[PDB]
Symmetry: D2
């Protein structure tokens, strides 16, 4: 397989039962890693994810946890260490979103997205780094961001804020822990073919509309994001820290400006 | 009298009793605006500031409120509309910070900084914009960010995240409400001579350290940021929305690279 | 009379006879500065502009010069120091553009745009700064960039490259000369009502297209950019160096994402 | 070997006989690619580079060319096609630099760095894209940038400009040709252990000084950059376009801000 240094590395993935999280679990499974699949409520998908990793060539366990609960995040990293012996790669992937005019967005709804998307990533990143520091491991953090750490998003001001914060969070932790050989990076996916977008992409006018904002002309396959995660996690990215690697088919390049418009 | 168009405009300023908030309070006073001074903690400072605004040629009230409590933020905008008749410029200035190695940062300390710096600014922005939409006003929002929406800040991951989040929040709201003539901008201060820095700068070794990180060579004067706020709030900045205007004596330009090191 | 500190300052403006350069010429005229108007091609326009500056309350000369010729740029600064006694603000405004699919762009067409847009601004900046260093003056440089130092621009790769280059040039010179009190900033215009756009906008379908890409909804007025220049040149912007201040009605905020598409 | 899709891909590398260029030739040689090594004057190093590629498992030819001469760049891509059958990956790596106070930097010296670093990359990128377009190949461009497309660099204003322009050049070409499946990306190396820096890193105070601006605490090995190039060139980066992937050990994260300074 591709990245041989990933063999038997322990990888924790939050929201890892579906979409990008699942595709990442499978890919790390293809690299013969030991994957810890976090999930919120749907146990059966997690169990399904677990079997793919096994079938792909990897070891895997599943662990229930809500990333807005500190104890769950703490339990997740502890369970990983308990079961597999260590922790090598931490992937904070869980996220929620919903459209609301910003002047009508409730505090509770704002908080839910901030707590889940940003705070949960802080908690995950903290617990992993704590462990790498205490055990002198040159570990790796991957935080799942979005093109929306750069692209503003009307109706999604909570989401946009959460990823803008995630960017400075990541860049801070990378600077802080770079002297310990702990690397910290973001991935910035564009429009991806995942369960949350599977509704949106039903309407063929909606699918076309979204595709019109992707310069490469297609909605990303989750495996294309998982490829970026495996690269970033590997010793191939040894000198890469504090970055956001956008995998968006050009979406951050301002799709309205194609053909010399403007 | 510089920006005549600011005369009699209503300007609400969270944390307007000390530091940059006070400096801005005074400045809109010099432009003879109606300044609403929010304070949390210390009425005697707020009273002293209400005075300066009045001497400078302005009108002023003081309103107690915690920016992390929704009712306090809603009450603040409502109070401005009761006392002065309307709202023209919403300035979200309140912020806090404290150094903690990130792997040792507690969730509550993380939450306090996020709640204060980012969520309070969201609440402030939301309440102002709502007032602007429903009443057909081409209002203005200034969000007080930091060089640290761009410069990462070890020991201050919570603060950095809050300002990174404020950037995307500001940019989203600027895009979302631009077609309505509502402008939304950030100011990015560097190291300013304010109460938030008084302990740091009292230590002559630390003042010297901070100064060596400012290309222009001096710690900023709070009135140098207030000049930026007056400009942005004015119709001089009519085509200017969604920006962060750094007032940092060059700090974002990478102080370690002066004289061609690297 | 807004920025009183600008009274009697010497302001050199390349391409100051039309468009934004003219708008800026007039504006420093209103601040009663001494405006030196560089023009390349068309004395009758430059004469018409010299007039407006004089009517507005300013003093003005016109100086013929090609910004791609070093002797012309050196002569221009020298002429300003001969006619007016000194130099206070150097504004590098001259720029050109034309659409060509990039894979069909000729080296000479690439070179013309680079030479004009970036190298001319370097030469202008260099000559002004040299004058500032050797004579202990806390002078000011404004470089006229574009939303396209950030927004990529198919069919205009040469123009985009020139402005991306202008950004790093400006930022380097701001850092390099900050300890001397010399400030160096960019302005980033969006789509402005100028001669460079007259053909584009004459076509009502094209004017409508461009307008749909501006969040604020209108093509910018040249005086809205000149307001930004007056601010930056003033001592109001004393702590502001190394920035790009976009005046673009929100264009850099990603027009394709209005209303939550994506 | 790692990226099997790279087997027998034709890769052109400018300045590919030494430093990062050489390390990239070798790595692509390790992936059993066919490498075309451009070089300026030192034929013997090129010949050495050629043999490593062969010994690493790859096919290779060498070709003399000055990237400031259009005919040489045109000849380079033509020779690649002549000899190997096609072109798949174009890598514009050639670059020069030298320290000069900016107000003393000559036009000729400015031009040399602009012509080499930026214009040469445009020429290389153009010739490759022309070929991919005419032959419906989903080819790949990698432009060698620097941390200095983001980090300003006093005494190196020409270099900083050239890479700032390279960034917008790349991002433009990525947006323009994304609909054809042609990806265009930058790599942003920090301080790397290469012939040009081999002088600087002799002085142990200079080596230490440079290392003090690398958060990860070491000067990059050229192979760590070559790893990024192989990733970007591969179908693993299928959804990655228009990006700059910094490989700088954290240098862009503002090294002066370590330990909560500022
Ligand atoms: O680091 C520069 C400055 O950034 C500001 O946002 C902080 O409030 C200061 O405490 C700090 O000195
Ligand atoms: O400053 C970091 C590094 O940047 C690169 O672009 C330069 O070529 C190196 O010489 C330098 O050490
Ligand atoms: O695309 C927005 C605008 O950018 C400016 O820099 C160009 O000069 C205009 O022609 C263009 O309309
Ligand atoms: O807007 C592009 C994409 O950004 C992602 O962050 C969101 O989760 C997707 O739903 C969206 O389609």
């Amino acid at each position: 397989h591709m990245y041989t240094d990933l063999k038997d590395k322990v990888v924790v993935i939050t929201g890892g039962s579906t979409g990008l999280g699942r595709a990442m679990a499978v890919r790390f499974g293809q690299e013969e890693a030991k994957v810890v699949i976090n999930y919120y409520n749907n146990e059966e998908e997690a169990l399904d994810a677990k079997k793919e990793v096994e079938e792909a060539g990897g070891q895997a366990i599943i662990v229930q946890g809500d990333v807005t609960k500190e104890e769950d995040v703490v339990n997740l990293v502890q369970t990983a260490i308990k079961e597999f012996g260590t922790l090598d790669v931490m992937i904070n992937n869980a996220g929620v979103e919903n459209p609301v005019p910003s002047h009508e967005l409730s505090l509770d709804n704002w908080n839910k997205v901030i707590d889940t998307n940003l705070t949960g990533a802080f908690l995950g990143s903290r617990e992993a780094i704590k462990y790498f520091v205490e055990n002198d491991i040159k570990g790796n953090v991957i935080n799942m961001s979005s093109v929306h750490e750069m692209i503003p998003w009307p109706l999604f001001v909570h989401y946009a804020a959460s990823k803008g914060g995630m960017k400075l969070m990541t860049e801070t932790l990378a600077l802080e822990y770079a002297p310990k050989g702990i690397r910290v990076n973001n991935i910035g996916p564009g429009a991806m073919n995942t369960p949350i977008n599977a509704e949106k992409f039903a309407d063929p006018v909606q699918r076309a509309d979204v595709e019109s904002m992707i310069p490469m002309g297609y909605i990303g396959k989750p495996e294309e994001v998982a490829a970026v995660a495996a690269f970033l996690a590997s010793s191939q990215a040894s000198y890469v820290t504090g970055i956001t690697l956008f995998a968006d088919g050009g979406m951050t390049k301002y799709p309205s400006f194609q053909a010399g418009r403007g």
